[PDB]
């Protein structure tokens, strides 16, 4: 699918495209993005080790730092795209009177005549 393609996509164009799809297509995209999230989080775990190993000891440290900084920009797009999946999902679970006040029967005419 064109949604969740391992690279960051603009949200407003996703927020429209998500509307005109089938429910099984949304579940396929939702599965695909979560796999993409686990791919970056296991990537950031590996980048986290190479930070903590060298932080214990400044060339080839800033290059690890902007690599995990860049992954947070792409990951910020993923859970924003997952947030649009949640909002599209929840839109599809909506779609005696003795006073002569009423009838003035003191008068001969009021009865029905």
């Amino acid at each position: 699918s064109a949604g969740g393609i391992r690279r960051p996509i603009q949200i407003e164009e996703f927020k429209t495209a998500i509307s005109g799809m089938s429910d099984m297509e949304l579940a396929q995209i939702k599965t695909e993005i979560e796999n993409s999230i686990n791919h970056l989080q296991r990537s950031n775990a590996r980048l986290g080790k190479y930070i903590a190993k060298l932080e214990g000891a400044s060339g080839d440290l800033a290059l690890y730092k902007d690599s995990v900084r860049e992954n947070e920009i792409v990951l910020n797009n993923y859970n924003e795209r997952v947030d649009a999946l949640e909002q599209e999902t929840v839109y599809r679970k909506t779609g005696v009177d003795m006073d002569n006040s009423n009838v003035d029967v003191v008068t001969p005419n009021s009865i029905f005549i």
Partner: protein, 49 residues
Amino acid sequence: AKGSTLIVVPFNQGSKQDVEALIEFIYDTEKNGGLGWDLDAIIPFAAIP
């Protein structure tokens, strides 16, 4: 107008007891908790359709 008064009472024409009590309530003295009046006119227009 001057000298005019109006009294509203809840009332059931249907009930015997209410009729007897109402007439007593008009003519009984103020000191026994009445009006102490004497009627000059009766207009019994009440009825149902």
